[PDB]
Amino acid sequence: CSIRDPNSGFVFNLNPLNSSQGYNVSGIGKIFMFNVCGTMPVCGTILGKPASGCEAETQNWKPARPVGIEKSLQLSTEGFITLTYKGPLSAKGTADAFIVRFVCNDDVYSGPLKFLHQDIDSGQGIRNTYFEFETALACVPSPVDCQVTDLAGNEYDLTGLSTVRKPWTAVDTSVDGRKRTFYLSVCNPLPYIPGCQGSAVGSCLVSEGNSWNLGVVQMSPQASLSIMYVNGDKCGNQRFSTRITFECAQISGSPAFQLQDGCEYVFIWRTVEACPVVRVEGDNCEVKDPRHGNLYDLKPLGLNDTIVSAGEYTYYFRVCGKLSSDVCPTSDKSKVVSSCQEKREPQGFHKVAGLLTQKLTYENGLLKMNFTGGDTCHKVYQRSTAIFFYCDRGTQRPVFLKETSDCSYLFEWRTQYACPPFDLTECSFKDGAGNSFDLSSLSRYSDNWEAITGTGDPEHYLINVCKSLAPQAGTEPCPPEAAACLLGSKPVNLGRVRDGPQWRDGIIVLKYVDGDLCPDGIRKKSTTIRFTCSESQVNSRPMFISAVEDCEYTFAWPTATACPMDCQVTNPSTGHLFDLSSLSGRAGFTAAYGLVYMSICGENENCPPGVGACFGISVGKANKRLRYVDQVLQLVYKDGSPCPSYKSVISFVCRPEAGPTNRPMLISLDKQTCTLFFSWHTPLAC
Ligand SMILES: *[C@@H]1O[C@H](CO)[C@@H](O[C@@H]2O[C@H](CO)[C@@H](O[C@@H]3O[C@H](CO)[C@@H](O)[C@H](O[C@H]4O[C@H](CO)[C@@H](O)[C@H](O)[C@@H]4O[C@H]4O[C@H](CO)[C@@H](O)[C@H](O)[C@@H]4O[C@H]4O[C@H](CO)[C@@H](O)[C@H](O)[C@@H]4O)[C@@H]3O)[C@H](O)[C@H]2NC(C)=O)[C@H](O)[C@H]1NC(C)=O
Numbered sequence: 001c002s003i004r005d006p007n008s009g010f011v012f013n014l015n016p017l018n019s020s021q022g023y024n025v026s027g028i029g030k031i032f033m034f035n036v037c038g039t040m041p042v043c044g045t046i047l048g049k050p051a052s053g054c055e056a057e058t059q060n061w062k063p064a065r066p067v068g069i070e071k072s073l074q075l076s077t078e079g080f081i082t083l084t085y086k087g088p089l090s091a092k093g094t095a096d097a098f099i100v101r102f103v104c105n106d107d108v109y110s111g112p113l114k115f116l117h118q119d120i121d122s123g124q125g126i127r128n129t130y131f132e133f134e135t136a137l138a139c140v141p142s143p144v145d146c147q148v149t150d151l152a153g154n155e156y157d158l159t160g161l162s163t164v165r166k167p168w169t170a171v172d173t174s175v176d177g178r179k180r181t182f183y184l185s186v187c188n189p190l191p192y193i194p195g196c197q198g199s200a201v202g203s204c205l206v207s208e209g210n211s212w213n214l215g216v217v218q219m220s221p222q223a224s225l226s227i228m229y230v231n232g233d234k235c236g237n238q239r240f241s242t243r244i245t246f247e248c249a250q251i252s253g254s255p256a257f258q259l260q261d262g263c264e265y266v267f268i269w270r271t272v273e274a275c276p277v278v279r280v281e282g283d284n285c286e287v288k289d290p291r292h293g294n295l296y297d298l299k300p301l302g303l304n305d306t307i308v309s310a311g312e313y314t315y316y317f318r319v320c321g322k323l324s325s326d327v328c329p330t331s332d333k334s335k336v337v338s339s340c341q342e343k344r345e346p347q348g349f350h351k352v353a354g355l356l357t358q359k360l361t362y363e364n365g366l367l368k369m370n371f372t373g374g375d376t377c378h379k380v381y382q383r384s385t386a387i388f389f390y391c392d393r394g395t396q397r398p399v400f401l402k403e404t405s406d407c408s409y410l411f412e413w414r415t416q417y418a419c420p421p422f423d424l425t426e427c428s429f430k431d432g433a434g435n436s437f438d439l440s441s442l443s444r445y446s447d448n449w450e451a452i453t454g455t456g457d458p459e460h461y462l463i464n465v466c467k468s469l470a471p472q473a474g475t476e477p478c479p480p481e482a483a484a485c486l487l488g489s490k491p492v493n494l495g496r497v498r499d500g501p502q503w504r505d506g507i508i509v510l511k512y513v514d515g516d517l518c519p520d521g522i523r524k525k526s527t528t529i530r531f532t533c534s535e536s537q538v539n540s541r542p543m544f545i546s547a548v549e550d551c552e553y554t555f556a557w558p559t560a561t562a563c564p565m566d567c568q569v570t571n572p573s574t575g576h577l578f579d580l581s582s583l584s585g586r587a588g589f590t591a592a593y594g595l596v597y598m599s600i601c602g603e604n605e606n607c608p609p610g611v612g613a614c615f616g617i618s619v620g621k622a623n624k625r626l627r628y629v630d631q632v633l634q635l636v637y638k639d640g641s642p643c644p645s646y647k648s649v650i651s652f653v654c655r656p657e658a659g660p661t662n663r664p665m666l667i668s669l670d671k672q673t674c675t676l677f678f679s680w681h682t683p684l685a686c
């Protein structure tokens, strides 16, 4: 059922509206039903044909005025889209008609079908009936409002995704061969891409110098969140479509190509923009958290003037208070200075950077302060000072970020004062052998770990290491005491922090306890994290393993962190262990000069005992601290004879074949530091 707008040049398709339940509405004491670009087998059979529309009176097996033998679709005088189902020639040479108009609504897809009126010419036996059908398919390809509300009343905004300077893209290749780059836009047309322009192209595939428009910017986002772009260029008998499913997540994600269902390309987009927008203003330097319920109080940060240095300038500000420092002098009028830029001489001056304010704003889990009303910059702008507060264990000094185009001076401050109540545990332990383990690097204060489960899993798992969870984005927050959490019906506490990690039956176990009540109503849920040493897993995530009787939850985590902290050293990136013990020995070797005697990993029989190298005079004591640096193995022999302290740096370099003269060579003598630099090309370094 497809037509062209002469004003627009767009190809409209109502194809997607073929449905099976069809569409059914009341009026004039009877119910009118039909389907679109499809049949309505209920009340069918005009001749032997299945009928597109019907009529009946009810509340009914019996149909009436079956219609759909002559189907017609066209633009009227307005340039508005009309579909006519004419039925059979009853009498007097005229057929019963259904006339249905398609009216643009960006916000809905198969939007309310309302009966309008019917014209009754009894004289000519034509009972002609008139309908309106709201759809986004009627809308000409144009940019869309990118703000959404769900039925629960949570507001979102995906404008973040559309405002980017770069075009979002998902690359995807097959087992061998196929290589393609998906361009996605949100609510706005794609940026200029060679081969993809059309009218309002939302998703585009480029492969082998062929571009495909896989959906036009048509319908607004729907509520988790979804967008569909439809009416892309021909795919056999159909036209291409793209579905993007948004999911609320800690990261600023990219859209990831998931699968292809006929002519529809489906993507999953895990991003922070998809998270319910909730924002709150406070005064008296305090603000209440809408999710947890706790009160942030930043008054403690204002008990002294805060000084931050930048390049040549130096910034003074007092949190929620008047500056005490003898700079930017201004008491005149009703202006209380809270922020000052001082450019130190030369060509230095003092500029007021912000006035007193005790307003603390909370915007989607960030705390902000803006000191306004400063000295004029760029004729029209008043200098302002913004501080962004993030949760952290200790309240460290703020750091200068940048000056905006409107002379807003931006500061980040990670401080515990921005952190809800939170439990903490010692995260280093030792095994039976005395090897050191420290998982403290996996403790996250601003975010949490998202567990890896199955790809369709309706539930997500949040975990932190050796502490209770950081605050989470959304309006369904976990109980504050939880260190692990389940996110179905309600947020489920899976366990609180009690003890640190322990070597239990030859594996690293972290146990959280006293979560929500188990279904039997006598026990409380507990979580076990089983850590397994894996050098390659450097950014790894915990994999959810099992949930026994909705009571015992178990995760596994292969990670490089869980690994223990003899002339051998490990490549920190690959894990290949280089052993230089096979070269050691009191016997040792000589390097060209006069000569130089030296032994590695051990002492030499020509020098004083305990000295690694000498000539004749000690040039360094033997030692065992081997470093891997820049694909080279390195020893430093220090504390030698007096420098007219002599020292020897020995560097081992990869050589796939053992050369005809495979002995170390003195490559430098630094006279300013009395340092002897040796290089040795040996197959042992590969
Ligand atoms: C801490 O608090 C202070 C106080 O709240 C905040 O500082 C303020 O920042 C405001 C920006 O939101 C700024 O308002 C601006 O007033 C200027 C005066 O010239 C006005 O030009 C700005 O107007 C822009 O937008 C309006 C409405 O759309 C337009 O009518 C106007 O022509 C300007 O349009 C352009 O810039 C917009 C963004 O600024 C663009 O969206 C828009 O596309 C358009 O771009 C064109 O012109 C731009 C140059 O102006 C150019 O970059 C672009 O290429 C195009 O050529 C706006 O009303 C306040 O002036 C400022 N406070 C003071 C004292 O001046 C500060 O943000 C706070 N810090 C934090 C953390 O928020």
Ligand SMILES: *[C@@H]1O[C@H](CO)[C@@H](O)[C@H](O)[C@H]1NC(C)=O
Pocket (backbone or CB within 6 Å): 018, 019, 020, 037, 038, 039
């Ligand atoms: C309409 O959809 C029905 C059922 O959903 C399917 O059997 C049929 O092939 C579709 N027909 C057209 C005209 O697209």
